[PDB]
Amino acid sequence: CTSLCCKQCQETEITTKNEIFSLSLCGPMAAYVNPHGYVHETLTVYKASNLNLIGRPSTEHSWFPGYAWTVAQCKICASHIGWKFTATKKDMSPQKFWGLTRSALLPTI
């Protein structure tokens, strides 16, 4: 549709395509390595729906300096979808966004 959905649920809408934006210089989606070697192709969107946040934000290993991450999973299927990123300095623009992992979404990007 207009929407990107949880892959496991197939039809649980997570975001709409207008929410995609370029936070980085490489573009809206790029591959990042987590501190255990796992690669996540992470799409930055201003806004996501139907996600449960786990825990509290953290700056450790943040792929976007000045932002802290909070794990985000599907509210319907509990599948890992990505992370909410929240600014740590008042001047960051934007002050929040979401990084959604390519492998967790439909249609297949």
Binding site: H36, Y38, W69, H80
Partner: peptide, 24 residues
């Protein structure tokens, strides 16, 4: 004290982490 190596999701039991981890 148990952290998923894939996602960063934190757990208070090793057994919870094992179940979650194998969903990835």
């Amino acid at each position: 004290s148990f952290v998923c190596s894939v996602c960063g999701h934190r757990f208070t039991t090793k057994g919870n982490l094992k179940v979650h981890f194998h969903r990835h």
